[PDB]
Amino acid sequence: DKKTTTLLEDRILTTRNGHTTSTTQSSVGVTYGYATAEDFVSGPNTSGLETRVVQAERFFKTHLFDWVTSDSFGRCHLLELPTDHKGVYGSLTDSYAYMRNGWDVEVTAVGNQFNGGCLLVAMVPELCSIQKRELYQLTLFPHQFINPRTNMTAHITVPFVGVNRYDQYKVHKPWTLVVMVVAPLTVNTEGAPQIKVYANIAPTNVHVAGEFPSKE
C-alpha cells in the first residue's frame, strides 16, 4: 500500500464534489484515465451558447452487484453512463439537447481483510459488450483493483470523450463502468460471507447547450 495496522496513513483520502464528500481510510490512490484535464469545452458546434451547471457536480449512488463465492473469473457487471438520475443532473438531460461531462468514480467492495479474491474496476469508452478473451486485456483501460487484503475502494477519474464535442445522451453513452471478478471471493473462517459492491459517482465539468421547450 506504501503507507503504514488497520486501513491507514497517507491511505486516508477525502474527495469532495460540490456539497458532498466521501472519505476512505484504505485508499490506493486515484487513477486518471487518458488525460488529467478536459479538452476545450467551447467549440464551434455550440456557437458560444453553452453554459456550465455546477449544481449537478456532486455524488449520486447505485448498487452494482453482490460478489459471492460462486462467481468465477470473468463474471462482470456493466453500468453505462450516464445512467438514470433523479436529481439535478438528470433534469438537465430533459432540459437541454446537448451535454458533456467527465466522471469522478468511486467503487467500494466492503468485506474484511480475511476475505481473499480480487476485483478489477475499469472505465471503458464505447462499450456495449465484450468477449471472454478480451477480458484478459481490460487493463488497457483506466482501472484500479480491489484486493481485500489491501483495500476496499477503487477511484478512477476520466474526462468526456467522443467523436463529437457535445453529446446527445438519450442516444449515445460514451462510458461504461465495468467491475470484473479476477480471482474468486474466498471467505475462509473469518471473512465476510459475501461483498456488496456499490458505486459513488459524480459528473464533472458539466456543460449544456440547446434549451428545450417545456412539455406545457
Partner 1 sequence: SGNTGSIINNYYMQQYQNSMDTQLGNDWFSKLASSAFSGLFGALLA
Partner 2 sequence: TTSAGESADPVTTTVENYGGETQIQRRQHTDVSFIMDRFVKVTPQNQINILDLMQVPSHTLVGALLRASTYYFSDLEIAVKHEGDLTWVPNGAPEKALDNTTNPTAYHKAPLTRLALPYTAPHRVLATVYNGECRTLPTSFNYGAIKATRVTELLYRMKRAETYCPRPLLAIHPTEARHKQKIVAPVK
Partner 3 sequence: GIFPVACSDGYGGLVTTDPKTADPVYGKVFNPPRNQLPGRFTNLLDVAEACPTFLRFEGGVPYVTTKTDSDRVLAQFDMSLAAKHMSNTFLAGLAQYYTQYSGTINLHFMFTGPTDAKARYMVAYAPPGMEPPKTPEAAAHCIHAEWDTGLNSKFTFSIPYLSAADYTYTASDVAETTNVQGWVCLFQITHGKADGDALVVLASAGKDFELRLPVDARAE
CB of 145 to its own copies, least distance (A): 17
CB under 5 to 8 A by kind: which of partner 2, partner 3, partner 1, none does 104 bind? partner 1
Show the beta-strand stretches assigned E in the chain.
13-17, 20-24, 31-32, 51-52, 60-67, 76-81, 96-109, 116-125, 143-146, 153-158, 175-186, 195-211
Task: Name which position in 21, 23, 45, 139 contacts partner 3 (CB under 8 A).
Answer: 45
Q: Is 8 in the site for its own copies (CB under 8 A)?
A: yes
Phi, psi angle pair for 140, to nearest 5°: -70, -20
- Nearer residue to partner 1 within complex by CB, 21 or 186: 21
After which residue numbers is the chain interrupted with C–N beyond 2.5 angstroms?
A: 4
Task: Name which position in 46, 101, 108, 176 contacts partner 3 (CB under 8 A).
Answer: 46
CB under 5 to 8 A by kind: which of partner 2, partner 1, its own copies, none does 84 bind? none
The grid coordinates of residue 174 equal 460514451
CB of 4 to its own copies, least distance (A): 4
CB under 5 to 8 A by kind: which of partner 2, partner 3, partner 1, none does 90 bind? none
Binding to partner 3 in span 98-117, by CB under 8 A? 98
The answer for residues whose C-beta is within 8 angstroms of residue 216's C-beta and 6 or more apart is: none
Task: Compute how many residues bind its own copies; rule: CB under 8 A.
Answer: 10
CA distance 145 to 152: 9
Cβ atoms within 10 Å, residue 211 = 11
Q: Is 62 in the site for partner 3 (CB under 8 A)?
A: no
